Each structure stands twice: as C-alpha cells, then as structure tokens.
Amino acid sequence: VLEGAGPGRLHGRLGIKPDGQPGYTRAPSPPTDLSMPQALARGGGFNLYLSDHLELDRTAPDARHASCRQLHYDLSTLPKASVIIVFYNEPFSTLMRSVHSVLNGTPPQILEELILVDDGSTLPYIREDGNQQLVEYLKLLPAKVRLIRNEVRKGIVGARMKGIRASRAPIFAILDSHIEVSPQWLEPLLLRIKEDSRRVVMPQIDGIDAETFKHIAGGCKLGFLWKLMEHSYEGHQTARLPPEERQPSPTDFQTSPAMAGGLFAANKAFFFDVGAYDEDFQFWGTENLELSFRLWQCGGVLECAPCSRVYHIFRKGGPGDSITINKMRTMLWMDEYADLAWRVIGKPRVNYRPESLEKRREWRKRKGCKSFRWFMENVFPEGDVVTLDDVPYLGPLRNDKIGMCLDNMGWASPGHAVGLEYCHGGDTQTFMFFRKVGHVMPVNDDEACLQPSGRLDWCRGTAQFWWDFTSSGQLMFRETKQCLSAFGRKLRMVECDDTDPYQIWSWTAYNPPDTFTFPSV
Ligand SMILES: O=c1ccn([C@@H]2O[C@H](COP(=O)(O)OP(=O)(O)O)[C@@H](O)[C@H]2O)c(=O)[nH]1
Ligand SMILES: [Mn+2]
C-alpha cells in the first residue's frame, strides 16, 4: 500500500520508520581534507563520502527533451512491468538511491514489482550472516520490493537470468544498481513493446559524476569494433545513413545494431523465445553484442528511446579468462566474419565450452536465424566492413629492399610511433586494410590508424587517415599523393616513383574461407 503518495513520491514516502524518523542515518558532509584518489579507491569508482551524505530521495533534473513532456499515456491500458536491479557489493547509498528513484518515479500500477538480485555479495550489510542492514531497511519499503540471492556469484548473465525468471509481469526492465531515473522513464518503454512484443527497447543514458555526483546529460546508434565491443557510430558512419535518419527527431524511436550496456526492456516470452542469454557466458563480458546479434538475426528489433532517460554513475576506479570466452562464443553469430574478429583479439585458444556452443548452433538453425552477412547488409551497412572483401589485405607490410616489416613496436593502442624491424611473423607485425575509408591499422586495434607521420593514432573516417595501396606496392597518402618509404630504416613521405624500391611494399592478400572453423580447445 502507498502512504503519502504524490508527484515525485509515486510510491509514497519511502524509508520512514514507525516513529516517523527515517530508517537511513545519512552521513555528514565529506571532510574538507579529502583526497579524491583515496576516496574513489575506497569507493570502487565512486566518492562514497558524498553519496553517503546525499539524500536517498535525491531530486534529479529532467534530461528529457521538452517535446517528450507533451505526451500522454494511459496507465490502465499499459502492461505492468517488473524492474530488475542486479548488484554485486553495491554500496548502501547508491543501491538504495537507485531503488528510491525507481519507486518515486514509477507509477505503482505499471510497476508489478522491483526485484533486487544479490549476485553473491560479500559485504556485511548485504550478507545474511552480518549486519542485516539491507534486509531490515527493505521492511520499510513497499511490498513490491523483494530481495533474492545467488548462493555464489554467477556474473552478469547468471544474475539477470535469476532475476528475469523470477519476474511476474509480461514485460521486464533491467536497471543498474547505481542510477537515477528521469521522469516518465518507463511509460515510453511499455507503450513501444505493447505495440510489438518483438521489440527490445532501451533507455538513453545520462551521467552522474563519480567525484561530484553532478547530473550530466549524454547518442543512440551503436555499431561494433572487431575487438568485439560496442562502438557509437562515428561521424563518417552516420553520413552513410539515409538523409531521413541522419538527424532523427528527439522523440522518435531509432534502431541500433548493438546495445551499449544492460539497460533495456523486453517481453519475457519473446526474450525467452529469441534465446534469452547464453548462460555459459562467464562473469562480465560481451553479452551485449551476442544478445544484439542474436536478436536482430532471429527476427527481433532493438531500438533506444530518447524520452526514456536514465542517469548512470560511470566509475573512476576499480577475472580475465572470462572476457575471451564470451568473445569466442559471440563469434558463433558472426559466421565467416568470425575469422576477422578471431584474428583481431589475438587468435585466442581457450575453453569456450564447445559442447554448449554446439547446442547453441543447433538452436540457431532450428529458429532459422538470418546470417551475419544479412546483419551487416541490412542492420549495419554504415559499418566499414560489410563484407570480407572490404578487408583486402591482412598480414605483414614488408619492404624487400631493406628486408624489414612494420612493427607496432609493442602495443597497438593509438598515440605512438611505428618502426621497421626484422620480420618475425607475429601479430605485432601484422596490419590490415579497410578499403571503405583507407585505413592501415594494426590487426589488434581497429581504432588505431597509421598516419604519414609514421605514428599510429585514433581512427577517424576522414582524409587525414586515407591511404591508397597502389598496384606497384606503394602506400600513397591520398591527400598529399606522396608515397611511404623505408629509406634508412626510417619512415618518411617521398615523391612517388615505382622504381624506388624503398617505397615499394608487399602486403598479404586477405582471402578467408566462406565458413569459420572454431579453434580447437
Ligand atoms: O557479477 C556481477 C557483475 C555485475 N553486476 C551488476 O551489473 C550491472 C552492470 O555491471 P557494472 O556496471 O558494475 O560493470 P562496469 O561498467 O562497472 O564494468 C551493475 O548494476 C552491477 O552491479 C552484478 O550484479 N554482478
Ligand atoms: Mn554500471
């Protein structure tokens, strides 16, 4: 039951005790002699001295465009929804604030429940063998709110699964454990899925500083890099969209090849029929790109909602064998393109659970999921590699005259010079070519682009990174029409003369198979 309800306290006044004083004892203002690096250290990314001093009913600004406030929903016609917050060792202030923001900002008749999932927390206030601070504080919240636990820590997929299974409503929404909503955040999501159950709709994300906690606005279309992480459409990538979509209205829903994180809503039935999540994914990793490829390919639709805004606390501080498994398993959905991605993350040989993954290959064909080439040709044709014929060359860039190859000289990360070293055949000495934008990059970072300076730097789809690889073997920078020379084991730009053997290179052609055979375990 809701006691004292009203605008901004849609579920009533939360956290009050029998005697009327609040059930949370807020903290004093952070000390004046307060070293920010130590505070983010002891807070796991946040300034917890401040969060503990801020109110759990903190009032946030409306990050929604003005046109979003001019819409009217009918809360009787909308399907109830289960919000699912999953947390591992989230502090009390941030966690309880996220919950307050949801209950205060979600009409109760469209919020079936609010499920808090303990993914094996090891803190006294969240542990069943300790303070019991969380358990006792929950008794001061609506009945909608129920806690459930994982015996041990199962990770992102494992805990969202425990949470989604427990839901009751037709629709479930997933929220982080360190967030604040803007008003009317859930109404747009319910309305969009009511009209088509196949749609997974995600809110657009604003920020909360992890040092000052100032609210900050934020950015819909998202692609992916061949290192297998989401990547917001670069400027030259929106320029390929149709004109009618290059600059979309701030109230319209627009699609997205990928989802950035795990803040989305979906119909529980459709979600379970479209594959749900790969429960052999380990801890935190590439689940976002494997749920995104699978959704689109198996008759789904992914779009963001500019009228559905949620604030998130991006951190400023703090396994490894897990992120490479999640990536190999994501390649199932990439078909022949998995060769390229496999090479970019370093030809990794791991135990990707080949048994369960073959039962995901069976499931994939039983549903008749569309190919990854379908994906690239119809969902992400703005990308730079829509077919593997767009990667004409992958291998060493060798200069026969001096008998040396290029070398990232250690790392592929942007911002450091390239060198000429004796050829040894390792990935450090392998480079790829993207022809749609003329990018000479190290195979291990498709965000790193060679420049006439001889230095790698961040890739931009522009003329300052465009290279032509001529048929004589030259690396001609398009804007100056000068060619690259290895003279004196130094890299300088010179006049183009196909008779100059110091500027003529050899680059391995890239003709991968039509099917990718996974690397043995
Ligand atoms: O084992 C885990 C890993 C993550 N999460 C939650 O999943 C969400 C996304 O993870 P997080 O934001 O911590 O990842 P990050 O971006 O910090 O690496 C957050 O609400 C986490 O608390 C969780 O409950 N258990
Ligand atoms: Mn987060």
Is 287's C-beta closer than 6 angstroms to any atom of ligand 1?
no
Protein residues with C-beta less than 5 angstroms from the ion ligand 2: 176
In this structure, are strands 81-87 and 171-175 parallel, antiparallel, or unpaired? parallel
- How many beta carbons lie within 10 A of that of residue 355, not counting itself? 9
In angstroms, rounded to a whole number, what is the distance separating the alpha carbons of residues 240 and 213? 37
* Cβ(399)–Cβ(391) below 8 Å: no
* Cβ(78)–Cβ(184) below 8 Å: no
Closest CA to 122 of 88, 92, 155: 88
In angstroms, rounded to a whole number, what is the distance separating the alpha carbons of residues 163 and 149? 9
Which contiguous run of DSSP H or E holds residue 64?
none
In angstroms, rounded to a whole number, what is the distance separating the alpha carbons of residues 10 and 369? 42
Q: What are phi and psi of 201, to 5 degrees?
A: -115, 130
Closest CA to 427 of 396, 391, 458: 396
3 state SS of 514: coil
Closest CA to 304 of 229, 208, 199, 217: 199
Ligand 1 atom with the shortest distance to the CA of 177: 20
Sign of CA dihedral 325, 327, 333, 334: negative
- DSSP letters along 20-84, please? SSBSS-PPPPPPSS--HHHHHHTTTTS-HHHHTTS-TT------S-GGGGG----TTTSPPEEEE
* Cβ(336)–Cβ(512) below 8 Å: yes
Q: Which CATH superfamily is domain 58-312 in?
A: Spore Coat Polysaccharide Biosynthesis Protein SpsA; Chain A (3.90.550.10)
Closest CA to 101 of 260, 314, 313, 311: 311
Give the CA distances from residue 416 to residues 404, 456, 489, in Å, rounded to whole numbers and listed in that order.
19, 6, 17
* Cβ(455)–Cβ(428) below 8 Å: no
Ligand 1 atom with the shortest distance to the CA of 86: 24
DSSP state of 31: P
Q: If you count them, how many residues does the chain have? A: 521
* Cβ(348)–Cβ(399) below 8 Å: no
The closest ligand to the CA of 317 turns out to be: 1
In this structure, are strands 199-208 and 215-216 parallel, antiparallel, or unpaired? antiparallel
3 state SS of 511: coil
Kindly calculate the radius of gyration of the chain based on its CA atoms and give it in whole angstroms: 26
Fold of the CATH domain 389-509: Trefoil (Acidic Fibroblast Growth Factor, subunit A) (2.80.10)
- How many beta carbons lie within 10 A of that of residue 101, not counting itself? 23
Q: Give first-to-last CA distance, the chain, whole Å.
A: 55
Q: Which two tokens stand for residue 245?
A: 């979509």
Is 284's C-beta closer than 6 angstroms to any atom of ligand 1?
yes
* Cβ(479)–Cβ(467) below 8 Å: no
Residue ranges at the known binding site: 86, 88, 119, 153, 176-178, 230-232, 234, 284, 312, 315, 416
In angstroms, rounded to a whole number, what is the distance separating the alpha carbons of residues 477 and 160? 49
In angstroms, rounded to a whole number, what is the distance separating the alpha carbons of residues 53 and 27? 4
In angstroms, rounded to a whole number, what is the distance separating the alpha carbons of residues 160 and 156? 6
Is 230's C-beta closer than 6 angstroms to any atom of ligand 1?
no
Q: What is the 3-state secondary structure (H, E, C) of 283-313?
A: CCCCHHHHHHHHHHHCCCEEEEEEEEEEEEC
Closest CA to 474 of 510, 497, 503: 503
Which contiguous run of DSSP H or E holds residue 133?
helix 133-138
Residue ranges at the known binding site for N-acetyl-alpha-D-galactosamine: 230-232
Is 177's C-beta closer than 6 angstroms to any atom of ligand 1?
yes
3 state SS of 416: strand
Closest CA to 433 of 397, 479, 398, 462: 397
Interval between CA 84 and ligand 1 midpoint (Å): 13
The closest ligand to the CA of 230 turns out to be: 1
Interval between CA 155 and ligand 1 midpoint (Å): 8
User: What percentage of the chain's residues is helix, strand, coil (to nearest 5)?
Assistant: 25, 20, 50
Residue nearest to atom 12 of ligand 1 (CA): 176
Query: Which technique was used to obtain these atomic coordinates?
Result: X-ray
Closest CA to 37 of 271, 317, 408, 286: 317
Q: Which two tokens stand for residue 392?
A: 């004409």
Interval between CA 385 and ligand 1 midpoint (Å): 31
DSSP state of 489: G
Interval between CA 250 and ligand 2 midpoint (Å): 24
- How many beta carbons lie within 10 A of that of residue 121, not counting itself? 19
- DSSP letters along 312-351, please? E---S----HHHHHHHHHHGGGGGGGHHHHHHHTT-----
Q: Which two tokens stand for residue 137?
A: 């504080």
Which amino acid is it at 332?
A: L
Resolution (A): 2.9
The closest ligand to the CA of 85 turns out to be: 1
- DSSP letters along 420-459, please? EE----SGGG-EEEETTTTEEEETT-TTEEE-TTSEEEE-
Domain ranges of the chain: 58-312, 321-379, 389-509
Which amino acid is it at 365?
A: K
* Cβ(11)–Cβ(108) below 8 Å: yes
Which stretches within 167-274 are classed as H helix? Answer: 187-195, 235-238, 243-246, 268-273
Residue nearest to atom 25 of ligand 1 (CA): 88
Give all strands (DSSP E) within 131-210, no chain letters: 145-149, 171-175, 179-181, 199-208
